[PDB]
Amino acid sequence: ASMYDLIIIGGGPAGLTAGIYAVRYGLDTLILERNEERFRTHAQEVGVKTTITEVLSVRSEGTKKIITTDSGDLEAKAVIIATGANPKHLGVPGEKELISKGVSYCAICDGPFFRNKIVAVVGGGNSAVTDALFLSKVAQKVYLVHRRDHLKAARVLQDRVDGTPNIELILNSHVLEIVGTEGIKKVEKIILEDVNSRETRELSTNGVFIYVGIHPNTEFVDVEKDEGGFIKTDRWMETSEKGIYAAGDCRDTPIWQLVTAVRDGAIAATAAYEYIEKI
Amino acid sequence: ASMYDLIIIGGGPAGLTAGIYAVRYGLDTLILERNSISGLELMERFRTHAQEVGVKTTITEVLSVRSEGTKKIITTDSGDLEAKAVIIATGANPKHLGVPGEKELISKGVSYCAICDGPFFRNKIVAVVGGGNSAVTDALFLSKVAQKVYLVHRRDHLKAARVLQDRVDGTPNIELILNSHVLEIVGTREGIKKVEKIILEDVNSRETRELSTNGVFIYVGIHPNTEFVDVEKDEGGFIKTDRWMETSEKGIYAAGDCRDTPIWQLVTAVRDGAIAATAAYEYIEKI
């Protein structure tokens, strides 16, 4: 093979939707997935080709796109970036180890588990503060920990945080380690350090929620992006390089706007179709 | 018992999510029911997941909701219900044209989502009824795959943004038909039952015109199912809320499309339901 009409990078909701549409449009398409819902099986049924590999780079020459993977170079007329995004990590001991065992990056998903429990939120932006306020509705107490001398969130949210009794705001503080229990292995405490006095502090917590930014997986593409790595596109998901599109969390969308992976995927596939049938 | 902690009106994604969360919060909750576009069975999963969780569902019709000292009275055709908190999750539906053949040919050529049905109308003829950003955007969308697109609007000009109108201007395979009103959608007499034609009428000259079309996409507004509640709304009838999904009535919340919401996507609906349940929980405990 080697040559294809369309190559979709990412096997998330955006990519899978793009693949299904493209196949129904009758395009020769391949999805590149880094590792293995129903969506997946559903896609396979439609007749999507998927290959477990990793993309290292993507270059465009003469109306052709060169995708270099560990398996070898691949060629395509059009490309869809659907690589999503990941939460930025604290990079401290116990974070990766206690994930799904007290450490989390979604406060709304784990709300009920921490009812009447003690909880810590790390971050200073609207996300950290919003979810600290959220968790305060259900948790006994919430520690909001930030490394700077002030919060970066909007004044309106900061005022609400001051308002709430059961939120304790700890500024000028950075996390040294998340320590867990004696089975079951779950979060038990966190060690803090004052950024100025180097003084240590131990806080008993049942959970730790981390909100220190989001990282879009777009380092391998050289299209136009915003300050943060999110790919800029038009209403048809087209990037700054004609023939290349982007869909899902890896794309540059306004804050108020939440996930629209399926819509982005659907549109990206038909915009690509229009592009292919013209070349 | 006629008394509950929380009552959720609507068994959609938002309501079912709210119910699941609420049960996990340990509240006595009941759902009132009447009776993802990639094509999947995810709605039933919510119900099963729900049943397993332990949420209560009853089939009934709600007529009104009034507050009487932090107590919420839900009056149904079956009788009055009592609750400490209420969540409105009744969703919304696209407005219909109200012409012959529309209801009969739904899922057989008539649709309200062009993005959902894109691949089916590849190399086919298509008609879009409407004049707003949605109708024009989806007309442009369909022109990328369809042979021909009729963009039909009843007014003398389009209400959509200029950038979208300029695009519609060429784009050779879109024909813009203004001052035009749909009289009927007619289906095939022979063969598989599908849309075959649409009858148009010029609003000014009363001249009629037949158009052969394989599909009709309708965009003439969205209707939130919120006439049975007397909380604060916009001219839409969309229920106004704060960040925590709370309505103008303390103790009453709203989630999903029935609410005044930036996005109508499923994830948002689930998110609204989750948040609404925890906001209600906080309200119930505090009092």
Author numbering:
A (entry chain C): 2 to 37, 64 to 208, 210 to 307
B (entry chain A): 2 to 36, 56 to 307
Which lines from the publication concern this structure?
Thioredoxins (Trxs) participate in dithiol/disulfide exchange reactions that effect structural and functional changes in target proteins via reversible change in the redox state of selected cysteine (Cys) residues. Based on phylogenetics, protein structure, and molecular mechanism, two groups of NTRs are recognized: (i) Bacteria, plants, lower eukaryotes, and archaea contain low-molecular weight (LMW)-NTRs of about 35 kDa with a non-covalently bound flavin adenine dinucleotide (FAD) cofactor. These enzymes accept reducing equivalents from NADPH and transfer them to a redox-active disulfide motif (CxxC) that subsequently reduces Trx to its sulfhydryl form in a dithiol–disulfide exchange reaction. Thereby, according to the protein sequence comparison, MmNTR is classified as a canonical LMW-NTR.
Protein crystals of MmNTR were obtained, and the X-ray structure was solved and refined to a resolution of 2.6 Å. The X-ray structure shows that MmNTR is a homodimer, in agreement with the gel filtration data, with a structural organization that is analogous to other LMW-NTRs. Monomers consist of two Rossmann-fold domains that functionally correspond to FAD- and NADPH-binding domains. The redox motif CxxC (residues 132–136) is located on helix- α3 within the NADPH domain, with the two Cys forming a disulfide bridge in the crystal. Remarkably, no electron density of FAD or any other molecule was found at the presumed cofactor-binding pocket. The MmNTR structure thus represents the apo-form of the flavoprotein. The largest structural variations were found in a region next to the FAD-binding pocket, the so-called FAD-loop, which encompasses residues Ile37 through Pro55 (in red), that lacks a defined electron density in the apo-structure and is, therefore, omitted from the final MmNTR model. The NADPH-binding domain is positioned in an orientation with respect to the FAD-binding domain that exposes the NADPH-binding site to the bulk solvent and approaches the CxxC motif over the re-face of the isoalloxazine ring of the presumed flavin cofactor. This arrangement corresponds to the flavin-oxidizing (FO) conformation of NTRs that allows for the interaction of the disulfide bridge of the CxxC motif with the isoalloxazine ring of the flavin in a conformation competent for the reduction of the disulfide. By contrast, the FAD-binding domains slide up to the dimer interface of MmNTR with the consequent loss of α-helix contacts. Subsequently, the two domains in MmNTR are differently positioned each to the other with respect to canonical NTRs. This modification is likely a consequence of the loss of FAD, which results in the structural destabilization of the region comprising residues 36 to 68 that disrupts the dimer interface.
